[PDB]
Amino acid sequence: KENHQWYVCNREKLCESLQAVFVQSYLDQGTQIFLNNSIEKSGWAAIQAYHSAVSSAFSLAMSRTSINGLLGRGSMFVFSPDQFQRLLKINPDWKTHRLLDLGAGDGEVTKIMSPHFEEIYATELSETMIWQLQKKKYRVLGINEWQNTGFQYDVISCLNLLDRCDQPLTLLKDIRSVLEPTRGRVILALVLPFHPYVENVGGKWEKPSEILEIKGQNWEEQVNSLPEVFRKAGFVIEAFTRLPYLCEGDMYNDYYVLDDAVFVLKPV
């Protein structure tokens, strides 16, 4: 039984359908390398002081996400390549044509997935993240463009976006409408406990226009409330796991941790 606090799952509190598709993850080599590299960056005193100074200077005028993109700081980690492959049930050599990463941030998670794809598309609202994504040579689409291109996507990733976008139910329905149907799969990560808002400039926020009814007193109860949400958009869970959503740190902490539920979805 895997008992690490970041990966452990109380299987008996999952509903019966979810028990059948849960996939155990663990703290593996790729995860530890991310943490090692994060600890090293937090030891760079002059770099951390610079990032802190610039973040304070521009905090009123820019969103926190755009400040991170401007500095190339605060990158995140959802899965290692091995964990990604295990969840998708694919070999290291596996390939398909087109990936779309919605709300891709600085692309440091996108690039874990990228070797399995010919073409990589991304969306982002932050101007400086778009710069990061374009430095990685991803094809950036507008947020109202990607679902109107006329072509479909083999894998759509939507990692830690549902709690941060204005219209998450429309988003899920838009994903469904341009996913390649015969083999297409969706990769979705959601921080639990679910606490949605739309980031604004200057630490401000706004409430989303659409509500997801996700309730529960713990990870497993909240996950049990997702199948109904996914099904309204025409998805059923093919596999899911619990993974720490890690982020690089600062002068006080070597890294930061949130609790991700990571799903592979198949169209009904």
């Binding site: 991170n68 606490h195 959503y245």
Partner: peptide, 12 residues
Amino acid sequence: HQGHSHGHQGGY
């Protein structure tokens, strides 16, 4: 203090 890039998080 910069925190997690995805933002502050509440509880259950």
